[PDB]
Amino acid sequence: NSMKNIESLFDYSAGQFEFIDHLLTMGVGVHFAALIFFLVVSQFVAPKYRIATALSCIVMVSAGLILNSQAVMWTDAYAYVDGSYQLQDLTFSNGYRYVNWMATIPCLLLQLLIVLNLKGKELFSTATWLILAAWGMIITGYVGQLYEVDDIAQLMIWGAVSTAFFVVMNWIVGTKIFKNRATMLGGTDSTITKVFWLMMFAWTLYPIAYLVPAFMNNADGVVLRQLLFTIADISSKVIYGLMITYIAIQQSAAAGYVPAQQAL
Ligand SMILES: CCCCCCCC/C=C\CCCCCCCC(=O)OC[C@H](O)CO
Ligand SMILES: *C/C=C(C)/C=C/C=C(C)/C=C/C1=C(C)CCCC1(C)C
Ligand SMILES: CCCCCCCC/C=C\CCCCCCCC(=O)O
Ligand SMILES: [Cl-]
Known part of the structure; x- marks a missing residue:
């Protein structure tokens, strides 16, 4: 898992290594700050759409914990020796992002189906095919990055x-x-x-990061990937769930929910 990533092939200057560290630690704070936001606003959502904001809270912590896990793992694997940070242990890999996407994606998809007003048979059926399609996508992609080296x-x-x-x-x-x-x-x-076009854009950044080993096999490609992952994360989970929430509230108010009509 660890030796299989291009991260293990390069030494990193101080600037590349602190910059990656700061992208991850920042990603944590963005997600845990939004968690508090999604949490406070759950009371202004009608019971119908209130699970959609709960799913946002679940994403914020799921991602937050894997990002925080990358951060620490990043600093335990390397050490500043002779003017550069050099691999010291086989602890860092992007494979834990993949196994994370198995959970966050079904949550990101479910809150969409919820605000769309699906229910019962169709909700359970559409949910089942999308998660299996998503899981197929994730699993085939995980096996593929094992060969990026x-x-x-x-x-x-x-x-x-x-x-x-x-x-x-x-x-x-x-x-x-x-x-x-x-x-x-x-x-x-x-x-x-x-929101749909936001999905199409943000999600397409991921395969672009997946191919960085193929057109930029160097330390600056390791930085660009994390930078791409950061932009995709922030857009696919934070901004995404912010608009899911706006939609949920809006319809709550239009449906006569008072806390929604007073929040807006
Ligand atoms: C190796 C690469 C193999 C893949 C090659 C790509 C070929 C398909 C291209 C785009 C499909 C985009 C699908 C998503 C677009 C959404 C369109 C939609 O929502 O469906 C239309 C709807 O029926 C309107 O009423
Ligand atoms: C918060 C994280 C999200 C929404 C992750 C989404 C990930 C993808 C859409 C990944 C797509 C991939 C392909 C389409 C082919 C290359 C391999 C993947 C898994 C990176
Ligand atoms: C293949 C694995 C199975 C994946 C399918 C998961 C099924 C998800 C179905 C819907 C869950 C959301 C339920 C929210 C309904 C709100 C109505 C209510 O609670 O009163
Ligand atoms: Cl994630």
Whole structure:
């Protein structure tokens, strides 16, 4: 897991290494700060959409803990020796991001289906296919990055299979969105279309980070990847769940929930 990542191949200057450390530690604070926000606003959401904000809190801590885990792992693996930080232990890898995405993604998808006003049969059915599509995407992608050092061709093939799931997954998402936005209240039929494009953008940054070993195999590619992961995390989880929350509140107010109508 550790020796399989391009991180293990390079020494890092002080500036590259502190900069990565600060991207992770910052990612933690952003998520734990948003957790408090999502927490305080749960009271202004009608019982119908209130699980959607709870799922945001679950994401913020799930990501926060894996990011904080990367941060520490980052500093335990390297030591400043002779003017550069040099690998000292086999503790750091991006594999724990992948096993994290197995959890956060179903939560990010569920809160979408919730604000879309699905329920019962369709909610359980659409939920099942998306998580299996997402899990297929994640698993094929995890196996592929195990070769980002040894067999790039393999990374390309698994990346290809992973993208097949990704494409099927977004097609289902978009289909349910455009077929059910006429149901949403307070004018959120316009917001949800924006959230979808936000999904398409932020999520597409991930495969771009996945391919960094293929076009930038050096220490500055290790920095660019984390920088890309940071931008994707902040957009796919924080900004994403902020608009999920806005949508939830808006419809709560439009549906006659008083705490929502007074919050707004
Ligand atoms: C190795 C790469 C293999 C993959 C090659 C890519 C080919 C497919 C391209 C884009 C699909 C995008 C799907 C997501 C777009 C959402 C569109 C949508 O939501 O569905 C339309 C809806 O039915 C309207 O009513
Ligand atoms: C908060 C984290 C999120 C929403 C992670 C999303 C991850 C992806 C959309 C990953 C997609 C990949 C492919 C489409 C092919 C290459 C391998 C992956 C797993 C990086
Ligand atoms: C393949 C693994 C299974 C994945 C499917 C997970 C199913 C998720 C289904 C819906 C969970 C959200 C329930 C929220 C309903 C709100 C209604 C209420 O609580 O009164
Ligand atoms: Cl995550």
